[PDB]
Design a protein around this nucleic acid. Structure first.
Ligand SMILES: Nc1nc2c(ncn2[C@@H]2O[C@H](COP(=O)(O)OP(=O)(O)OP(=O)(O)O)[C@@H](O)[C@H]2O)c(=O)[nH]1
Ligand SMILES: [Mg+2]
Lengths: 326, 181, 1068
DNA sequence: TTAGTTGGGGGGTGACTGTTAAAAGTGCATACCGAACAAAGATAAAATTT
DNA sequence: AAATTTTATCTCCAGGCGGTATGCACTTTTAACAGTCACCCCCCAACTAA
């Protein structure tokens, strides 16, 4: 269920936070699910350009009318940001779009990985599909495919409380520490920009606004603070050993290491690689009796690079494409 | 550890208090009798004792149990981690020593043969701390024969013990202790 | 040495002390039980201390004088443990475990009567009295009452010990007055023949006049449909094999040798490789590794046996008797073969568990048969049986093979009982773990001994499917490279997977048939399930005679391979392949920063698929070459509905065009007058060019293109190459060769043709629906009425769909225009076939998508939209086509749903008499096995407490009933063809026979269809369902609802079935 | 490697006879986590929800 | 009771997730006193095969 913004002061504060860069004025803002179009009006008020990736056509003409005589500040592209570049391989239906076509339409030119940030995406995560969106974004980030092909793009979105706590887990908190936390802490710098209760937004259903006071009391039962987080991809993510070709092996290693949480690192290295596990633990500077729950993400990346840098053995991994889809 | 002695002990059970309290009476009755027999008669009257005595002993035991629950809870908090290490090391050593002692005893009860005698054990036996000092200097040998005579004695002892060793393996199979082979 | 003397005396004293202590009061087996009842304990004490010649024999009578749901997992495991100890002859262990469990109160609860009965029988087989009396004390203290089996065990013990007549007679009147009968005692299931012989001796010691009931002639089936098959009045000309008797006996000896060896080795058909240095070095390394692995496996097995035995000595259940069943060398060789058979991609852990346990049971059964002495009896009986099937030999009175087999007097066939599922899985898990830890291999293979660290051969990795994770065992990559480099020329097959060299054993009962020694099942099912077998056993013995005879008839058909087709297929396979013709290509011929991976992954996937296809083709072609100059037989069995499937999986006649083209009948027949015409029409049918044309036009077209047939027969691979344009190219080539040989001969009328001719049936499901409903409109459409031109529904549906597509494309839809002419009978066939069976739009869309993907010329970008459009149009076109079929389908589905609501699975009986049950149930809880590597999650089939799956029971009742009706028709046709001397083999709805006998086979098919559907199937089904489910007096309202639903059957229409006899295109 | 050998002298457990109750171990049972990405659709049952 | 939400999808040729916490019922262990007395372990050295 969508949750648009309809509070004027909240819209103004969010606009100020989004345009929190006095330097580099013209950030082209990619917005999702504009809804009523109040945050959009606030964003044009401050002067920044906007592009609306509207996922539904019921409220497109109002935004188009509001954008009349705007001299190109407001451009509406009917698209769903979370359906970009479908992997089915067939023809692309209008709700989805190909990233190349969209970015050619918008007139965005590719930049290298080490260059500056071209765009900024402002929006909200799916209500019930946060764990799907995070995985899809991670797969697109590590492989340098879809929108991440054109460079390093910030994605500023609202996330729920429980998923935020699971994402920002640390070895200090062993219960919530899992794979997705490791990959999203290795691949990006996550910062908390704002906090806001759930009731600040007005829930929209398929029929329309959720105006029944009975569910409003139920909304109190469903109330959870929605954190606004910022992800800027790290410049030094890719090294000689960790490349867009090797990311599958790293993902499988991370999933296998958390398959049996209450176990040591060597107990997994024995099942993953034929190399000497004790030698690798010695090289990465860790004791033999080291749990997998006591390893920071940097330790995991150092382990992967240390195994990959070995030149003694021709066969160093047991992962293969036959393991997938079986 | 000495810190383990510092931790307080659990309250004595009711039957034991009756056995301890009633002991000085029984040194008056018959002090020359074997304590094991005396334990039985106190137990025999613990069997015949009234229920009210058991009830009052149980009440006292419960009160002392709560009391001890309190002092031990307070005491285990104030101690230092080094004392934790001391107690854990001592208890692990105690369990290991208990396990080893039983294994050596089971083996000595199963009639395991002895190891062959040695030149030095024979020297000590001839000598008949203080001995360790005397045998030390005496060990230096100016006689090639002294080692040789010992070899013949070693050879004689080895042959008989090996015959026992091949023999001893048989009954362990007969009894069922095949793992000791 | 006084010290030595004192040591010796102390050791002697300690030895004496230990001996005295052991004599008066360590691990020792416990025999004397401890009983709770004080009176019984005192009785045991006084009986033990009464006298050295203690009245054990009289105490037997003293104890026997009084005689006033599903088991748990642990109970089943203990029962299996006791019976396996009985087989293995380790009775002291069973007695010790029994007394230990009798000690504790909680463990006392598990024991039941069967366990005590088994231990008593074990002790009786040796004749002991003291232990038997102890077990009697235990069973009496438990509060149980002795039964017939206990008294039989007592009598067997008394007979073996040659005891006097007094105690025997006393026990006799006691058992007689307690309400038991000796006749029931001599018919107990769990009594070996030796036991019955000893009991007979013991009884005849007292009463010599007592005699067992005499034997009687077997009864004959008297059903209406099967009356003519078993009638003794008429003229019968049964087929006889062409082979003489001596060769048939030698073939039986060879098959017995092969099955006793349990393995068969065949030479590979791959391209030979010259012996370079690298190949020889790899072979030496591989041999050394195999020897080391064998020794390690032996040592690990010994250690595991010791540990499991020590576990039992503490009173806990284990798998020691199961390990002791087979010799260590057999287990080691089995494990090594399984290791060699592992694919490079690896196999799941649970699959390795089901596989290692399945192979252990078969070898156990074969060893039991070999030791027990049934092998020699089977040899003698089979050698005397083969006189029926020999050309030179004769029988005094001809009869069916099963009737003769029983007429000689069959050996009493006793095989072993399947283990429970928990034991089956635990044994496989233990064996797989042993294989994993035992094997080791050097780290650097190509380099000899640079490093001495040893790495495991097999690893344990997790494979993640969505949220779920699965455990996978994967071979070390260097070992796979070594296997590839060595390139050994020898393959290994299991004796079950290879066609028999001798005529198959006749099916006489649901427990005997098919392979000579190896275990086989009449109805194939998952391992735990047993309902089908129970329903088969509880039926009258004379019900299944038709099914068994049909299976035996299909089994006794001699095959042979086609030399020329085999030679041509080897040329293409060994020389770069021909994937267009179905011969897979060699992997050497391969298609071969984020952009490079998107190509490498695709290339690797294509290479993997090609490699898998080539491996399967290699298996089939190696097996085919190994059987080049031999005659082989393929046995048969049924699925739970009744349809017949050959047992050997790799090489049978259900395969692709290569498999159906390599095979041909061993016995020939003169073509006669119409054989050549039937061959030409078969060639045209295989071509597929003419499918809506009458027979005259097919024959005329065959005569038009005779030059192409002759050219393709003369120069197959270097000529005009006409034969590759057919729908089935390889079969067409063989038919062309047959036709060319027939034509070029002097007199074509006398030619001997070994090639089967296929006659198949159009819209079989709708042909049965229209017969059940007697719908004239439906009947005329499916070729049930005399017509001059073939008619099919599928072409009409295709035409209507194309018309709708044309109208839609007129208005400007892109998807309508893209598939302008790709609409064909092929895409809509399966959908309009299964629409009446209960397919949903999801299934239809998936089927249409599969066909469109298989087109290979349709623009693949539009597959999704095309599938949606096509399925929508097909379901729109079929809105009002079938009426009576849909009425019958609705009635069946509603009845099945209402039956399945109340917790009872659907059952019905086929018109022949075979009982059928649907095994669909809901498994709420899944079991696990705690262990070292991991915990396997399995499904406990064989649980009747689970509720029925109302979705599956309603969905499958309409399709399954029609399949049972088709199998019955096939069986009747085969039985009535066998009397006329015809050779008949079938594929579900396709019937094969020689060229000259096609007219007779067609006549029999039509007559048997009419006779089968003359009976009122629907009314009988309704009556059976009412008597079975509705008659139960649980609730009046539920039974009333079932009665109202079931008692209303669709009315029959207006259609006489006698017109089917004149229908030319009913089968064509 | 390590543990078992002989001499007097020293000490520490356990053998014992005996009950009492808290702490450990054993075997089954249910529940929740991973919600590995990879568009979209139609229909009718199966389950919760109020 | 009636609605909403959630789930699976024609049959057959023989299929199944793996790990970590938490609860309960039950049997089996160990520590708590009392005195007697024997065995085992040093103490401090010295060799040697299993
Ligand atoms: N439920 C079900 N039955 C099938 C399926 N495929 C085949 N059958 C059954 O097998 C029978 C024979 O199918 P085929 O010989 O391929 O075709 P057909 O329906 O006889 O029609 P023709 O192609 O004209 O011979 C069908 O009539 C069905 O009874 C399937 O996918 N599902
Ligand atoms: Mg057909």
């Amino acid at each position: 269920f969508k949750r648009y913004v309809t509070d004027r002061r909240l819209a103004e504060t969010l606009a100020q936070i989004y345009l929190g860069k006095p330097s580099r004025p013209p950030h082209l803002l990619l917005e999702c699910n504009p809804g009523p179009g109040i945050l959009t009006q606030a964003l044009l008020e401050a002067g920044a350009k906007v592009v609306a990736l509207e996922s539904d056509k019921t409220f497109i003409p109002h935004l188009e009318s509001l954008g009349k005589n705007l001299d190109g500040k407001l451009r509406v592209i009917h698209c769903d940001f979370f359906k970009l570049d479908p992997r089915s391989g067939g023809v692309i239906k209008p709700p989805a779009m190909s990233s190349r076509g969209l970015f050619k339409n918008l007139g965005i030119e590719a930049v290298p990985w080490t260059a500056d940030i071209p765009l900024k995406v402002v929006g909200m995560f799916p209500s019930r599909g946060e764990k799907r969106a995070l995985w899809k974004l991670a797969y697109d980030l590590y492989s340098c495919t879809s929108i991440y092909k054109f460079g390093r793009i910030e994605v500023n979105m609202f996330i729920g409380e429980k998923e935020f706590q699971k994402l920002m887990a640390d070895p200090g908190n062993p219960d919530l520490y899992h794979v997705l936390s490791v990959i999203w802490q290795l691949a990006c710098e996550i910062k908390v920009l704002h906090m806001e209760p759930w009731s600040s937004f007005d829930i929209y259903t398929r029929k329309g606004p959720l105006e029944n006071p009975k569910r409003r009391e139920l909304l109190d039962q469903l109330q959870q603070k929605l954190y606004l987080i910022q992800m800027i991809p790290r410049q030094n993510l890719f090294t000689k050993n960790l490349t867009p070709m090797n990311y599958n092996i790293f993902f499988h290693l991370l999933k296998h290491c958390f398959g049996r949480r209450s176990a040591t690192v060597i107990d997994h290295l024995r099942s993953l690689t034929p190399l000497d596990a004790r030698d690798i633990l010695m090289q990465i500077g860790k004791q033999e009796d080291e749990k997998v729950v006591n390893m920071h993400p940097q330790d995991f990346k150092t382990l992967f690079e240390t195994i990959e840098r070995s030149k003694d053995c021709a066969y160093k991994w047991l992962y293969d494409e036959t393991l997938e889809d079986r | 550890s000495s810190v383990l002695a510092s931790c307080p002990k659990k309250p004595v059970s009711s039957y034991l208090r009756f056995s301890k309290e009633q002991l000085p009476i029984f040194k008056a009755q018959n002090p020359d009798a074997k304590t094991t027999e005396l334990i039985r008669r106190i137990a025999q009257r613990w069997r015949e004792l009234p229920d009210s005595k058991k009830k009052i002993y149980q009440d006292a035991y419960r009160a002392e149990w709560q009391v001890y629950k309190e002092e031990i809870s307070r005491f285990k908090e104030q101690l230092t981690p080094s004392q934790i290490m001391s107690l854990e090391k001592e208890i692990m050593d105690k369990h290991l020593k208990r396990k080893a002692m039983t294994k050596k005893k089971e083996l000595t009860l199963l009639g395991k043969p002895k190891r062959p005698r040695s030149a030095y054990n024979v020297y000590v036996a001839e000598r008949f701390q203080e001995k360790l000092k005397t045998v030390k200097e005496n060990w230096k040998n100016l006689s090639d024969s002294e080692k040789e005579l010992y070899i013949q004695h070693a050879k004689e002892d080895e042959t008989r013990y090996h015959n026992e060793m091949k023999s001893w393996e048989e009954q362990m199979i007969e009894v069922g202790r095949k793992d000791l082979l | 040495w006084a010290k030595i003397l004192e040591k010796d005396k102390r050791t002697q004293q300690m030895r004496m002390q230990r001996l005295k202590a052991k004599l008066q009061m360590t691990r020792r087996l416990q025999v004397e039980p401890r009983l709770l009842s004080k009176q019984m304990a005192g009785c045991l004490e006084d009986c033990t201390r009464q006298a050295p010649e203690s009245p054990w024999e009289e105490q037997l009578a003293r104890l026997l004088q009084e005689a006033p749901a599903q088991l748990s997992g642990q109970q089943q495991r203990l029962l299996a443990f006791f019976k396996c100890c009985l087989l293995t002859d380790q009775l002291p262990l069973a007695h010790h475990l029994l007394v230990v469990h009798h000690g504790q109160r909680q463990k006392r609860k598990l024991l039941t009567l069967d366990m005590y009965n088994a231990v008593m029988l074990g002790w009786a087989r040796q004749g002991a009295f003291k232990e038997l009396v102890y077990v009697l004390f235990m069973v009496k203290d438990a509060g149980l009452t002795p039964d017939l089996l206990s008294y039989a065990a007592a009598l067997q013990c008394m007979g073996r010990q040659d005891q006097d007549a007094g105690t025997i007679e006393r026990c006799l009147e006691q058992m007689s007055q307690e309400g038991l009968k000796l006749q029931a005692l001599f018919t107990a299931v769990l009594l070996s023949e030796e036991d019955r012989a000893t009991v007979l001796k013991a009884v005849h010691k007292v009463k010599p006049t007592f005699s067992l009931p005499p034997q009687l002639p077997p009864p004959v089936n008297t059903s209406k449909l099967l009356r003519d098959v078993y009638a003794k009045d008429g003229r019968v000309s049964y087929p006889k094999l062409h082979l003489p008797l001596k060769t048939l006996q030698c073939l039986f000896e060879k098959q017995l040798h092969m099955e006793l060896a349990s393995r068969v080795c065949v030479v590979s058909v791959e391209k030979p490789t010259l012996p370079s240095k690298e190949v020889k070095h790899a072979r030496k390394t591989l041999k050394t590794l195999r020897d080391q692995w064998e020794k390690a496996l032996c040592r690990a097995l010994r250690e595991t046996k010791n540990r499991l035995e020590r576990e039992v000595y503490e009173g806990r259940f284990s798998l020691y008797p199961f390990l002791c069943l087979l010799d260590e060398r057999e287990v080691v060789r089995m494990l090594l073969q399984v290791l060699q058979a592992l694919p490079a991609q690896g196999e799941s852990f649970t699959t390795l568990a089901r596989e290692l346990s399945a192979r252990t049971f078969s070898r156990h059964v074969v060893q039991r048969q070999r030791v027990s002495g049934q092998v020699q009896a089977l040899q003698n009986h089979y050698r005397k049986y083969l006189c029926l099937l020999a050309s030179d030999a004769e029988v005094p009175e001809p009869c069916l093979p099963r009737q003769y087999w029983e007429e000689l007097g069959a050996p009493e066939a006793l095989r072993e009982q399947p283990w429970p599922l928990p034991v089956q899985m635990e044994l496989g898990k233990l064996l797989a773990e042993m294989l994993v830890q035992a094997t080791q291999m050097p780290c650097s293979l190509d380099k000899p001994h640079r490093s001495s660290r040893l790495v495991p051969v097999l690893y344990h990795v997790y494979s993640f499917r969505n949220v779920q994770q699965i455990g996978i065992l994967k071979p070390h990559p260097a070992y796979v490279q070594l296997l590839e480099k060595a390139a050994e020329p020898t393959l290994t097959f299991e004796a079950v997977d290879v066609p028999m060299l001798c005529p198959p054993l006749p099916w006489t009962s649901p427990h005997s048939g098919a392979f000579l020694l190896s275990p086989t099942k009449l109805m194939r099912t998952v391992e735990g399930a047993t309902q089908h077998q129970e329903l088969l056993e509880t039926c009258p013995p004379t019900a299944l005679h038709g099914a068994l005879d049909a299976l035996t008839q299909l089994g006794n058909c001699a095959w042979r391979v086609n030399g020329r087709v085999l030679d041509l297929v080897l040329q293409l396979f060994q020389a770069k392949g021909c994937p267009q013709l179905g011969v897979p290509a060699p992997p050497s011929e391969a298609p071969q920063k984020a952009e490079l991976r998107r190509e490498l992954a695709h290339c690797q996937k294509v290479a993997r698929e090609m490699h898998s296809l080539r491996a399967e083709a290699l298996y089939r072609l190696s097996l085919a070459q190994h059987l080049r100059d031999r005659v082989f037989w393929l046995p048969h069995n049924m699925d739970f509905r009744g349809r017949t499937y050959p047992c050997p999986p790799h090489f049978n006649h259900l395969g692709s065009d290569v498999a159906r083209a390599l095979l041909e009948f061993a016995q020939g027949r003169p073509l006669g007058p119409h054989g050549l015409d039937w061959l030409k029409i078969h060639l045209v049918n295989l071509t597929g060019l003419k499918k809506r044309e009458p027979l005259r036009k097919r024959l005329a077209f065959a005569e038009e293109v005779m030059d192409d047939i002759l050219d393709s027969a003369d120069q197959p691979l270097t000529g005009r190459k006409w034969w590759m344009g057919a729908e089935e190219p390889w079969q067409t080539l063989a038919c062309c060769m047959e036709v060319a040989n027939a034509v070029r001969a002097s007199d074509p009328a006398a030619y001997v043709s070994h090639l089967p001719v296929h006659q198949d049936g159009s819209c079989n499901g709708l042909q049965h629906y229209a017969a059940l409903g007697r719908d004239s409109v439906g009947a005329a459409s499916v070729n049930l009425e005399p017509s001059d031109v073939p008619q099919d529904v599928y072409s009409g549906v295709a035409a209507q769909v194309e018309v709708f597509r044309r109208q839609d494309a007129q208005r400007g839809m892109r998807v309508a225009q893209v598939l302008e002419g790709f609409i064909t009978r092929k895409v809509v066939k399966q959908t309009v076939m299964t629409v009446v069976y209960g397919v949903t739009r999801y299934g239809g869309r998936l089927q249409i998508e599969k066909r469109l993907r298989e087109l290979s010329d349709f623009p693949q970008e539009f597959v999704w939209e095309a599938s949606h459009y096509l399925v929508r149009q097909v379901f729109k076109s079929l809105q009002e086509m079938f009426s009576g079929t849909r009425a019958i389908q609705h009635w069946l589905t509603e009845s099945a749903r209402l039956i399945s609501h109340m917790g009872s699975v659907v059952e019905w009986v086929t018109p022949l008499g075979v009982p059928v049950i649907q095994p669909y149930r809901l498994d709420s809880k899944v079991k696990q096995i705690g262990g070292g590597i991991q915990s396997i999650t399995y499904t406990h089939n064989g649980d009747i407490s689970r509720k029925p799956n109302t979705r599956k029971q309603k969905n499958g009742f309409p399709p399954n009933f029609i399949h049972s009706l088709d199998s019955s028709h096939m069986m009747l046709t085969a039985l009535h063809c066998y009397r006329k001397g015809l050779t008949f083999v079938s594929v579900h709805d396709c019937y094969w026979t020689h060229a000259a006998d096609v007219s007779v086979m067609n006549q029999v098919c039509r007559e048997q269809f009419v006779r089968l559907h003359s009976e009122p199937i629907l009314q009988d089904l309704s009556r059976f369902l009412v008597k079975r489910f509705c008659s139960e007096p649980q609730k009046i309202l539920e039974a009333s609802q079932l009665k109202e639903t079931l008692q209303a059957v669709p009315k029959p229409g207006a259609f006489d079935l006698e017109q089917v006899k004149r229908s030319t295109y009913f089968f064509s």
